[PDB]
């Protein structure tokens, strides 16, 4: 059973957390429960707190350009973990288990997430993207503060520990039957219809789950569909400081067939939306830093009813795009092209129904494209 920890610089405070990532099925969010290991000596007269902060940030550090940055705290919560006070409530059988295996300088803390918060999502612009880097961070932070610092309004850095956790999006415990994500278009060319229909088994796919896209074309036209391309596009909309817009392809496939005049075809291609599908991890919405192994694509944004979408920071959504390259005519120079889209949601699977300590820092991807530091 792994447990993550990070030690203060001055060794006076040490945080212990059960997980690096906390689940959010639409109904509730795993609270953050852990323990702080204080050094009785280095922490005398001073009190130790633990805060949970969620903030949206905008701005990069690119040399020779006026520095520009924006921060908007979406949620803040602080709890005193020391000296012991019932500020955390009952104890977690995880906390108890830990307090024992650890010592008598181990105190529990518990921070909970409200329901009006987005999940982890961030990005970095690619070479030709006009926007700047931005994202939503979730920081857990334990810190020691004497009464002289409470006065002078400062929190000694040396005696503080910081952890950036992920709030990942999982599907609700139980949902009703899922209808198929269907749709059909009829493109008229010289009064002869070229019918197109695209459908998916369900409306909510999971990261890693193959998506079976079925394309059905009934070409009663005089032209020939030269090629059929199908891709998964990730549409991103920054909504807090700048209205940036990104739309990238995260998976794509094409059929070999062709659809001659007055003939039909029903083919079905399978795509798998994965960050790993491409080396360039810039210009797409991720749930973690580009340089980290465990980082995945951001899940579709779920906006609880009643809350203003702008509070979500960055809006992420997915769609399947079908591109039909249609042959011109007799003396064809160029060939036309019709495109169409079908929306679907993407997230992690439903939730589920001897300690080995390890460093919190996440391992880095070995060949993680390009990125700002």
UniProtKB/Swiss-Prot annotation:
Which InterPro entries does this chain map to? Arrestin, Arrestin-like_C, Arrestin-like_N, Arrestin_C-like, Arrestin_CS, Arrestin_N, Ig_E-set
Organism in which the protein naturally occurs? Bos taurus (Bovine)
- Its name, as the record gives it, is S-arrestin
Task: State the Gene Ontology BP annotations.
Answer: G protein-coupled receptor internalization; response to light stimulus; signal transduction
Q: Which GO terms describe its cellular component?
A: cytosol; membrane; photoreceptor inner segment; photoreceptor outer segment
The gene is SAG
Keyword Phosphoprotein in the entry? The reply is yes
**Keyword tags:** Acetylation, Cell projection, Membrane, Phosphoprotein
Disulphide bonds in the chain: none
Q: Which family does it belong to?
A: Belongs to the arrestin family.
Domain comment from the record reads as follows: The C-terminus of isoform A interferes with binding to non-phosphorylated RHO. Interaction with phosphorylated RHO triggers displacement of the C-terminus and leads to a conformation change that mediates high-affinity RHO binding. Isoform B is C-terminally truncated and is therefore already in the optimal conformation for RHO binding.
Please give the Gene Ontology molecular function terms for this protein.
G protein-coupled receptor binding; identical protein binding; opsin binding; phosphoprotein binding
């Amino acid at each position: 059973h792994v447990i993550f920890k990070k030690i203060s610089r001055d060794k006076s405070v040490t945080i212990y957390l059960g997980k690096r990532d906390y689940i959010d099925h639409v109904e509730r969010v795993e609270p953050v429960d852990g323990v702080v290991l204080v050094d009785p000596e280095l922490v005398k007269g001073k009190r130790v707190y633990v805060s949970l902060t969620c903030a949206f940030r905008y701005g990069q550090e690119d040399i020779d350009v006026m520095g520009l940055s924006f921060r908007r705290d979406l949620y803040f919560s602080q709890v005193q973990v020391f000296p012991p006070v019932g500020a955390s409530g009952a104890t977690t059988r995880l906390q108890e288990s830990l307090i024992k295996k650890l010592g008598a300088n181990t105190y529990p803390f518990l921070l909970t997430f409200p329901d009006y918060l987005p999940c982890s999502v961030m990005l970095q612009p690619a070479p030709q993207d006009v926007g700047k880097s931005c994202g939503v961070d979730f920081e857990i932070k334990a810190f020691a503060t004497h009464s002289t610092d409470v006065e002078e309004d400062k929190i000694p850095k040396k005696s503080s520990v910081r952890l950036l956790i992920r709030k990942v999006q999982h599907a609700p415990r139980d949902m009703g039957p899922q209808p198929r994500a269907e749709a059909s278009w009829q493109f008229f060319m010289s009064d002869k219809p070229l019918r197109l229909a695209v459908s998916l088994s369900k409306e909510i796919y999971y990261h890693g789950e193959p998506i079976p896209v079925t394309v059905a074309v009934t070409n009663s036209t005089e032209k020939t569909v030269k090629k059929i391309k199908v891709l998964v596009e990730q549409v991103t909309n920054v909504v807090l400081y700048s209205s940036d817009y990104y739309i990238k392809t995260v998976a794509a496939e094409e059929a070999q067939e062709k659809v001659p005049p007055n003939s039909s075809l029903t083919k079905t291609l399978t795509l798998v939306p994965l960050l790993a599908n491409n080396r360039e991890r810039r210009g797409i919405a991720l749930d973690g830093k580009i340089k980290h192994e465990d980082t995945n694509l951001a899940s579709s944004t779920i906006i609880k009813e009643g809350i203003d979408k702008t509070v979500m920071g960055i809006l992420v959504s997915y769609q399947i795009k079908v591109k039909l390259t249609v042959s011109g005519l007799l003396g064809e120079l160029t060939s036309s092209e019709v495109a169409t889209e079908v929306p679907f949601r993407l997230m992690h699977p439903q939730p589920e129904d001897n300690f080995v300590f390890e460093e919190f820092a996440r391992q880095n991807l070995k060949d993680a494209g390009e990125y700002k530091e």
